[PDB]
Symmetry: C3
Amino acid sequence: ADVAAGSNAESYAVLCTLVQLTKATKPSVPKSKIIDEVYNVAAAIGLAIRGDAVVKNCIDKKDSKYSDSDIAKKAYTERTWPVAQAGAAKLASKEKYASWTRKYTEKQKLKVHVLTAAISDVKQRADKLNKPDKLAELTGALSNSLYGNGKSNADTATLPAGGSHISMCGPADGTQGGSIVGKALKFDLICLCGKQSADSGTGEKACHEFSPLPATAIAENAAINADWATIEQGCKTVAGAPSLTPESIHAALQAFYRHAGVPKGNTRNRYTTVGAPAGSGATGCDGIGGSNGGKCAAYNKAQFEAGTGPYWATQMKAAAETLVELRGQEQKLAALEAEALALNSTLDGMQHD
Amino acid sequence: ADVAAGSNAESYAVLCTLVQLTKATKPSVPKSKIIDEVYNVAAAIGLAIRGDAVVKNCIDKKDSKYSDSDIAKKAYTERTWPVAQAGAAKLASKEKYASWTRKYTEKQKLKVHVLTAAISDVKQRADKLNKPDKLAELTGALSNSLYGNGKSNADTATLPAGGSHISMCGPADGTQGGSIVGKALKFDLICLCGKQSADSGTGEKACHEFSPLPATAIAENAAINADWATIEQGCKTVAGAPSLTPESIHAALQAFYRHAGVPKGNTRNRYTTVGAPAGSGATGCDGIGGSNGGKCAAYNKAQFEAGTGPYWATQMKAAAETLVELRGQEQKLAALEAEALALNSTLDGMQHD
Amino acid sequence: ADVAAGSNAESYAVLCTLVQLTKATKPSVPKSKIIDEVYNVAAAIGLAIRGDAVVKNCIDKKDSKYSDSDIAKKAYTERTWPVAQAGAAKLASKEKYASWTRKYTEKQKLKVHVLTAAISDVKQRADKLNKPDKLAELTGALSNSLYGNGKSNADTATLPAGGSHISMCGPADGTQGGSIVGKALKFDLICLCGKQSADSGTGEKACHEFSPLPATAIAENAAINADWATIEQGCKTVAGAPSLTPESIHAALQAFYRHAGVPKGNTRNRYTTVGAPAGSGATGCDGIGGSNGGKCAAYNKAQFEAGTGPYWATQMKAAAETLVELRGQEQKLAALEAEALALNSTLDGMQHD
Ligand SMILES: *[C@@H]1O[C@H](CO)[C@@H](O[C@@H]2O[C@H](CO)[C@@H](O)[C@H](O)[C@H]2NC(C)=O)[C@H](O)[C@H]1NC(C)=O
Ligand SMILES: *[C@@H]1O[C@H](CO)[C@@H](O[C@@H]2O[C@H](CO)[C@@H](O)[C@H](O)[C@H]2NC(C)=O)[C@H](O)[C@H]1NC(C)=O
Ligand SMILES: *[C@@H]1O[C@H](CO)[C@@H](O[C@@H]2O[C@H](CO)[C@@H](O)[C@H](O)[C@H]2NC(C)=O)[C@H](O)[C@H]1NC(C)=O
Ligand SMILES: [Br-]
Ligand SMILES: [Br-]
Ligand SMILES: [Br-]
Ligand SMILES: [Br-]
Ligand SMILES: [Br-]
Ligand SMILES: [Br-]
Ligand SMILES: [Br-]
Ligand SMILES: [Br-]
Ligand SMILES: [Br-]
Ligand SMILES: [Br-]
Ligand SMILES: [Br-]
Ligand SMILES: [Br-]
Ligand SMILES: [Br-]
Ligand SMILES: [Br-]
Ligand SMILES: [Br-]
Ligand SMILES: [Br-]
Ligand SMILES: [Br-]
Ligand SMILES: [Br-]
């Protein structure tokens, strides 16, 4: 018999909070205008003191790449050529560097270049903070959570060949886990909310009063992307619009853990499972109501207890840690700005001696 | 008929977590004693090297405001006069600046003032971190959450003219939202827990075993502040004392979203609603039990799905972001201290040459 | 009669989230290799300029503790002797300090030592960040949460002398709290899940389908550590593996507050209680089903409302604040690195003059 309409609604809301987290507005990567501006000033000062010949040549060739008549090749390498290019751009714009464009000892020039090289190191370290790019890692963790690692919606359009509804969503063994469950939120929600082959208009509303109803029977090789579209679009109705924050992610995961973790079935023998086992649950998650099966999605008990499953919980935890790191990036940039400005002030004073 | 005692208790606890967050102990604004002390030392050093005449005059006039016989007007402006005032306070206390009070070149004095001006810039930036004041923004977001933006308890003492219990708390249309719901936690809880005009001792306990019972029938122009006092005072009994943290706020919001989001009514057609629709809910949230109305409070489904309602969820999210920013302020001050101390050390060494 | 199997399962999961938080992987203490390396370079530079005699002696005695023929005792004190030791280790390894090992004025040497002393201060402040050690405070808060402050599993092996199941777990007064409840998660879970003296195979499964069943009747002086082992080992099955984060802790506490806070009993008169009061609850938490007692654990209503109980909630909040502080430590170290590197660069340039 069809499972009852609304019988999986609580489970739907719990997983839908996690889905909605993948749709939430993302943060921006912190940036430091101060570090750029200090770097450009130090570049210009460091070039200015090398003499009219290197200055003229560097400006002449500022659009060129480092790759013998050019005197700039003796003062700069491919490594430091971006410095000269930045410095040439300022000195081809300035009267502000007039003090630097006076005369200095070889030693004075040495000490000045210690400071300009140090400022260039700050800029380099500022750039390394987001190598690799943490916004792209965030996006990838969230996409992985929905579809599986490295997968997209289009890659995950069909269920595997050769399994049954039970083997895929929840075996007779109440600790083993469905073969497609705990890999991706999309497949968990297909098991939880999808049409069972004998459903007749009611079981397709186990999770929600969907319109249109899920129409493709969950079975081997089933093409499920239209039903997934309908299922995932309802998540905002039942879980709203939580913010993309580490706070939200860990709150949603602990709710999921307790919701799946309470044992189910009329003998409390269906472990780490969402949805509603019917009767004892002993048949497994067959999608059918009225006997001992049920429309449910079962996780692997041992992975769940160890914190190694579901795989999307690990991706959601990585997303959370990336959000913490992006917050941290802003403070690390502030620290780098403190070093740059201290150096920039010391260098400013040296224009005298 | 009266709705059943306790029939809204779960909804009451969920909203009461958010109420209790507005009563929680607030954080303090981070402060930097180091930056103040470095600023005062640099102020004193910067004044000391300008000569006995400017020093004497600045100390003479340290209590005056910048607004021709005073020689300090040539060495300072209204902008930098606070520097002289800070410096005069130290030099009118010290033998510690004896080294600075020796003789220096015009150039040495120039370079010293580059460093003292840089330290003054650090102090200025330290002060700008809390302009605008983030504790006041926090307080305002929390107050806005309870009463509506810019409103107080006294401003929100009466329900609007011209509406019914249904129009205010939850219309017949199960997606539209009550006209006073989703504006302020106070009015949500008045709809959820308030007396319906025909209640007889039981419906007034829908949310909680209140003593005294809510006594003012929820209807147009109703004066509800005594009932609000009773309702809000019970929140600690059912939601305890969560800490005011961004973690707590986002955890409370995701719980609310799922709690409101599960569809209600015996045909699952009452969307984004808290409390308990009676029967089908089709009558709307009339506060009455036994038929198809119910004592409930309905949010606007489309705003809820978009994350633009309830309006107090947006204020609570702003409160959370302000708490994150106040944490961040402490680290930004540490960075500013690093710049100040580096400069202060460099300046210390210059007392020699 | 035995309480029903599974009748406390929801309460078990809620408390088990907090238990699992104490078993989660801990963070590491942030460290700064940059600050160590800058400190060692400044130590070596600061020693190098003091002359061949102090250099030779310091290296000679680098393994000794500060405690008259040694010339290093005139250049260093017990306070700064670690500096000399660090500096001697470098100068006994280097040709890198060749520039420093040239000739300098007394003034030049003064100014150099201002910078080396400032770098030593950075290192000292870096070390003070984790004095006291925040990882040990974290560990202690989590252990305190489980067992009570300063207690271990072995210290808490037996229930107190002279009380009854009711007096220990939940008195007749539905606001007073059990005498052993709200002190430690371990004793809360013993009250919630332990065997009542007349249980016959079913009541021992109130919380979970334990194997082996809890076997020791909860009564005065009861030796409960074997039953605690079984009870706590099931927590991973029902609450999974939440990460040890401030986000997780505050999310788990707000869930607990609402779960305990909803009033219970058939007249809604059992306040701030977990588990399932039977009938009215008026008998108290006797562990017995079928009448008006029940297998429950009651907190003190007034402490709960004030946020001063349960005592393990305060410890969990301290754990959360320590985790926030350990995150903050990493950013504070970044700031300290900014000061060190700015100073290190300025000192580098002085090798010229
Ligand atoms: C970095 O130091 C430079 C000085 O080299 C600062 O830029 C001077 O600041 C004064 C402000 O009164 C102006 O008169 C000059 O025109 C500025 N430019 C130059 C090239 O000297 C600069 O403000 C410092 N900070 C940053 C972020 O670059
Ligand atoms: C800022 O630098 C000043 C030096 O200008 C430091 O204050 C000297 O420190 C020594 C400590 O041995 C004392 O003998 C002097 O009396 C101090 N005062 C002065 C005016 O020189 C100060 O510690 C540094 N840090 C801060 C926060 O001001
Ligand atoms: C601190 O400053 C020192 C300089 O005193 C830096 O160490 C020199 O850096 C150059 C790199 O081109 C090498 O040729 C030298 O051998 C380095 N060593 C010394 C002793 O001068 C060092 O990199 C700076 N940073 C830290 C963290 O120490
Ligand atoms: Br149905
Ligand atoms: Br986005
Ligand atoms: Br350069
Ligand atoms: Br790279
Ligand atoms: Br089974
Ligand atoms: Br799994
Ligand atoms: Br009733
Ligand atoms: Br306060
Ligand atoms: Br000044
Ligand atoms: Br301002
Ligand atoms: Br309806
Ligand atoms: Br709304
Ligand atoms: Br039973
Ligand atoms: Br560990
Ligand atoms: Br030294
Ligand atoms: Br210490
Ligand atoms: Br009672
Ligand atoms: Br307590």
